[PDB]
Amino acid sequence: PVTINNFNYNDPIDNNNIIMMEPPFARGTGRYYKAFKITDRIWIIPERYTFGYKPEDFNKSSGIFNRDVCEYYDPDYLNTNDKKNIFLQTMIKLFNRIKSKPLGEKLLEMIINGIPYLGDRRVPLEEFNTNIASVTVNKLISNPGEVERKKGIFANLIIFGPGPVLNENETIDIGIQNHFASREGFGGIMQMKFCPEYVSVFNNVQENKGASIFNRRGYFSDPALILMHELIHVLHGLYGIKVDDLPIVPNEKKFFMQSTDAIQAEELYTFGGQDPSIITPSTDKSIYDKVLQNFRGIVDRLNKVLVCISDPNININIYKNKFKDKYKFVEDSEGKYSIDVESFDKLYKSLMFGFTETNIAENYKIKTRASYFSDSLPPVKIKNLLDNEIYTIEEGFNISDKDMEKEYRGQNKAINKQAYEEISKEHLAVYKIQMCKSVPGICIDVDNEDLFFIADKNSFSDDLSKNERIEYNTQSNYIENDFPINELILDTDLISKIELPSENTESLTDFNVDVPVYEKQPAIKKIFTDENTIFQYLYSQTFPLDIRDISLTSSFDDALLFSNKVYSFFSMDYIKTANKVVEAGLFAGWVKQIVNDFVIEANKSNTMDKIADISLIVPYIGLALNVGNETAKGNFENAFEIAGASILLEFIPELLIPVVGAFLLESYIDNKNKIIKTIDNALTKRNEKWSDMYGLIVAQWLSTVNTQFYTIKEGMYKALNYQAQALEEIIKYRYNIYSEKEKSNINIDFNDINSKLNEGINQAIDNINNFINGCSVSYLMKKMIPLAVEKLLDFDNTLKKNLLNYIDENKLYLIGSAEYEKSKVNKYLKTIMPFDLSIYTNDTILIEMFNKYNSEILNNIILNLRYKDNNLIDLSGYGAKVEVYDGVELNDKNQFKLTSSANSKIRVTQNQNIIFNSVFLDFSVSFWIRIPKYKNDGIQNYIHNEYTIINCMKNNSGWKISIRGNRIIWTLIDINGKTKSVFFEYNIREDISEYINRWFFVTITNNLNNAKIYINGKLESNTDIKDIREVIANGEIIFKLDGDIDRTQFIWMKYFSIFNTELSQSNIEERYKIQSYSEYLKDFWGNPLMYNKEYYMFNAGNKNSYIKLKKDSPVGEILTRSKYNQNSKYINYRDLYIGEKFIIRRKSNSQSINDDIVRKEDYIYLDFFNLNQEWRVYTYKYFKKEEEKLFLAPISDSDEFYNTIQIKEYDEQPTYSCQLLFKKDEESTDEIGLIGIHRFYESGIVFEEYKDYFCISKWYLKEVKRKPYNLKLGCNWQFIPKDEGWTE
């Protein structure tokens, strides 16, 4: 176990556990420091760290030391013995808390026993030298008797108090003659500047700080985790693995980029979590290798060490035993030391991935920031860590007796206010970027922290481009940035049980050492830009403190111009109400109104856009921040549908995607085993190449893209809050304008207001977070992974020949097998590795994002052709090249027509880098189509001639969609030429067909077994496709009528899209209902219903019937449609162009016209033509019966007839039918009835019979309410205009 010593600053010097030490950076001169041995090899010097700092720099100035920290200054901290003692007692309490658990105690035991090797790179392998500043430190024994006698001691860690910046804790290593023993396998005394009271604050971006924008937010850190974080660095330095390699350096070429120091992998390993994933598997291995090479030199020394010249009293065997356990070397029965790969491996992972801030935090149930890369808030002062009511050894701030264990309540700033104190902003300093305009140009100060962190291309290793030699030896190399924290906590032989050498030794005489020199830099950097991006937009949403009367504006430019003007990205109506002034008696009402509006506006963050295959879109992000590519101009939803996530990025990073180095296989003539082994190894190494490539991508996405999206998320949180703050300000102002007398009667509750505004904001934030996370993943998958696959596929091919050629040259030595493997090589380089984020990270948030994304069917769209600027483009996000030739017609209703002309075609060159070739065939194709009726005189050719319409082939393999008369066919052709088809044939002898010349929905799905065809959501045909082998489907897609067609043949299509998976009957039904939806009604053929267009009327309840003005009566009789008269046996139908020709007129124009489209609920006039005149459909106002014959007469205004109709749609399911309702007036809720058909009996002097007439019945009013909706209802009508697709 670990023992924590006790003492008070005032205690006497005993030259043993309380000494006068000469610190390493004192160069053996200057004064000594009273130091206390808190535990073996660990000292505490309760004083400020002054080494390398100028005395005046302890005062706050116009400068800063670190560009990414809100630095707090206080030169008085620790300037009295009582303060020093409080520091001492506090450290003791933190150490006790650390050891209070197995994980922490082990970290301490490891640190205590990880004594620096005796010597560094300069020492001869056969020697131990203690006379160097990294191994020995002196204490002044000098009591009475030769004032100036000094003893040397060994030490592992010396912990000082804070340097100039209290909240800037740092672990420091000793460099000598330009080198660091702590970075070369030796290890060396470690130092640290630490402050337990002023700790960092952080706030979970995805979460919420008690969910209160008006209350304090964020969480304050537990000083014990802060200490353990630094202790982890100590551990690394003590074991000599604090190696340096290719660091993450931020790009700083643009003004919006965040400046900062290079970040070494060791730092990111220490934090843990997702951060390790920012270090590529390549650089992971580099570091791994460097460390191993360091231990190799050390293990060689242990075998050659013979003496210690610096100290005759040092016992060689004791140390060799100690270093053996320390580095986990194994020794044989003779005493020969070597490296055991398994043990080295376990030790390395334990130290780099086991002890991390993340793992420790999770173990101690302490909360911390999500990642190394996240906005750093201002620090706070802990009132009294020494008071067990606030902080305890066992639980820290999260004390259960105070019910502060759950949700880290003890660390929440809005809950545990008795534990901390805000800091005087007067003592804080931050690096700012002053963004100036070319104008005296106006200036805006932005905190470096708020800028986008974008890792520069130079941050990532290019080791993938190097060549690899293959051999019967060659094995895979995977370093898991993970370690089971439980086995570490239960590891029995981990913690050394080998004697710890005495600390006394010869005093140090060689004080040679490099002392770091520090200096502040300007806290403000002025740059010039006339850009108005996120920073200016956020600024335009604030207002000076000396201003209390403001008004909202949608004009960004004015907001920047006037201090009393504040920018708002909310609706025009929201902005007018917010600026509205009212009488005291109407104030309460107004408040309830504008607050409610705020919530409604904020909630538009849950806007859907299913028709464009986008489930979540936050329409106002663009207006709010104008981030990325001018997202504040134009409509944002549209801009997104076109370019996607990419338009939100402030910068498009240049990815590093190297050309994977070539393999060199070692030849083994005669050896049959070695040669086979080689091939297989190359096969596995190739997989290592795919994995490493992916790891390289993930790392870039995390440090160059996801970080940008993080800034955006933060920006939205700030934006929404500014808005709330602005409304609250306006409200306060209006209220306070009134007199006390008036206020007494105004019923207002300001805390409920903030509450409601707040709730609106939280709901908005969760939406925004989902939206933005999805965008991030989208960019990874569609804009990064594909670029990597391209190279990997290339590499593959190059290796394919490389291998077969290899198997060729060695043909003989392989004998009757060169063939067996000739294929073993083909079948392997076939199956390509699917990307899986959980392989490169274990961060729960990131995994969830990925799983969420992969569960949303719409992310399976690999091709989505939509209309834009009179042209079709792929909006799937994979960027397919689309060539639409001159013979193709396109309209803004997403309809495109393929005619019989040669130039009437579309060529689609697909993205070859998408996992489409899943090996077993899994994909769907969907689209709407309108196939014209057959020419009556050309029925023979129609049923005999098959012609292709969409063809996708490559190497005589692929899929095809074709047509033969009334049949639509789906065909597959595998690599071997085997064929399978499935088809849907519709009847051409129906009096009334639902398909001939009518828009209908098609969907073909393909899985390992079947090929299914769905029509309007319903499954229609199936085919077993087991035999079918590999089907190459990523060839060029050609849309064109190909076959022996009639020159009049044409086809209309809409919404053509492809999915790289099998859609379920459920997915299809939904897609069908989504693409069927519209505000307007449709005509018989399925096109928008138009005003001022002749139409024949169809009745769904009486298919074979039609309306005709009765010769003598002002009524419409119902007649039986005429039928196909010719003698073909293949066809039959009822004429559609018969009966009166109606025409829908708009009732009120100015109200909403400027369009000829008929929208549901519109009020219309239903007219028709009686020769050279236009007549109208009327209803006698006074019928008392259930129904009555409609009145058809010239257009006139009779006070006795209703002439206004409201076109309705009562069916909730897709339909081309519509209903016509007669209401008393547009306002009342008095329904007269619906237009339909009724049967009347007529008994005359000569004729006795039944006749149907064009009527209005109230009976329908209740029937249309039933469910499912009765399509056979006689009140269901459809309008039929003449159409080239239908001739009779």
Curated annotation (Swiss-Prot):
GO biological process: proteolysis
Cofactor: how and how many bound: Binds 1 zinc ion per subunit, to the LC.
Domain of life: Bacteria
Encoding gene, per UniProt annotation: botB
Region spans: Translocation domain (TD): 440-854
The protein, known as: Botulinum neurotoxin type B
UniProt catalytic activity: Limited hydrolysis of proteins of the neuroexocytosis apparatus, synaptobrevins, SNAP25 or syntaxin. No detected action on small molecule substrates
Residue positions binding Zn(2+): 229, 233, 267
Regulation: Proteolysis inhibited by EDTA and captopril, and by peptides that encompass the VAMP2 cleavage site (Ala-Ser-Gln-Phe-Glu-Thr-Ser and Gln-Phe-Glu-Thr). Translocation of whole toxin into neurons is inhibited by toosendanin.
